[PDB]
Amino acid sequence: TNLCPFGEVFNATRFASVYAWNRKRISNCVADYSVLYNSASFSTFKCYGVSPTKLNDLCFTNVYADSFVIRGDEVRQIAPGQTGKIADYNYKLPDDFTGCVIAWNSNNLDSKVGGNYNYLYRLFRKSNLKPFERDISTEIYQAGSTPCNGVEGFNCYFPLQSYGFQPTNGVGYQPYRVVVLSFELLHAPATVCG
């Protein structure tokens, strides 16, 4: 009979990079979604498959909460049926996605003068991701036909490139932290109600 800890997902001052987007399970708890939609300070709050009011009295068996940091223009790629450097290479949502996508500006938290080079993004990958598939490989992207032997050079590139966030960057390139919720149902008894 515990409340679901959405806050320690939201109050975390270290979100992981988008290539190693971070997964927390929310279960065995009654859920208070009412503090989320009533915040009204997000720059992006979409729900996909369920109305935000109706989901409070709705029972689920497991809630997965993805959380990561992307760029401002790349918030549009977190949606079922999008492409780009984030949807193909970093974080792919399924087409039958049943969760809510939450995003807020964090130019102030996550940028600093001289560039916050801590947040990385996989700029190259051979094949595109499955839904919810994580690629944390630092293996050299063979851009050509010559094998690389794991060094950099001609047609041999490192995949994890770094976002350089300054606070003077424009609104399209300010670091918008994103927390993607995901809801599921099984034959198991529902652990997440509200």
């Epitope: 190693a20 293996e139 950099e152």
Partner: antibody, heavy 123, light 111 residues
Framework: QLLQQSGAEVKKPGSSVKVSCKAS????????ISWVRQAPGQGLEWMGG????????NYAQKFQGRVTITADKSTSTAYMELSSLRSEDTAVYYC?????????????????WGQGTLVTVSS | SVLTQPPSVSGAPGQRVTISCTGS?????????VHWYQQLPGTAPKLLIY???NRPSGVPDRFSGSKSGTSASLAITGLQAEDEADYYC???????????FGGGTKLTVLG
């Protein structure tokens, strides 16, 4: 052919250990090289890690502020400059590598661990 | 160590023993994959079970891992004298932003 790592150490509290980790072999300047600790007779503990083609350094919240992990890709050697801990710092310090398979889930190391530097702090 | 794992197990050579790695909702239960490690005494530890159910190059087929929700199982079949070792489960953790290990099980064969 596996990995190179500096020999055993005995230190005083307040001094500092810079234990090296030479590319025991394989790819280096393109792989996350971590550091894992083991207190003698105790369980393993991750310490930190770098991706020595950039210079990013993650650390555990326990070992934060004291350890600094760096590498020079010209010499293919990592470093683990621990600042000082008093008496429970005595532990064998392996030097794991990091592959990072794609899919679901996360880091397994390589199998490449160093032979084990036992840095003992004592008076 | 965050990943709860028993102190030790004990079995017979030829028997089957199973080593539990129970985590939390942030480390194992959150879909991250466990990794099992073999430490022979006085040796540098090595890769045992790869990627939650897989194997690296050079391990017998007696070791196999699995995962069911907020748990894991290091399935060891047909215990041996060279299986007396310490077994550490590694599963990455979400809230810590770091790869946490397990409690370690000393495998003791009898006879």
């Amino acid at each position: 052919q596996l990995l190179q790592q500096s020999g055993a150490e005995v230190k005083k509290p307040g001094s500092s250990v810079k234990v090296s980790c030479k590319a025991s072999g394989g790819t280096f300047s393109s792989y996350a090289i971590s550091w894992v600790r083991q207190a003698p007779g105790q369980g393993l503990e991750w310490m930190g890690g770098i991706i020595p083609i950039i210079g990013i350094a993650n650390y555990a919240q326990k070992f934060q502020g004291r350890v600094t992990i760096t590498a020079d890709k010209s010499t293919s050697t990592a470093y683990m400059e621990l600042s000082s801990l008093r008496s429970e710092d005595t532990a064998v310090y392996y030097c794991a590598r990091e592959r990072g398979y794609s899919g679901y889930g996360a880091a397994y190391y390589f199998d490449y661990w160093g032979q084990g530097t036992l840095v003992t702090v004592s008076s | 160590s965050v990943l709860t794992q028993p102190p030790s197990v004990s079995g017979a050579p030829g028997q089957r023993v199973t080593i539990s790695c129970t985590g939390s909702s942030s480390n194992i239960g959150a879909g991250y994959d466990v990794h099992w490690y073999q430490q022979l005494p006085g040796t540098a530890p090595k890769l045992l079970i790869y990627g939650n159910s897989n194997r690296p190059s050079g391990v017998p087929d007696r070791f196999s891992g699995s995962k069911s929700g907020t748990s894991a199982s290091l399935a060891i079949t047909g215990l041996q004298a060279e299986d007396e070792a310490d077994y550490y489960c590694q599963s990455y953790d979400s809230s810590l932003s770091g790869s946490v290990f397990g409690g370690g099980t000393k495998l003791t064969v009898l006879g």
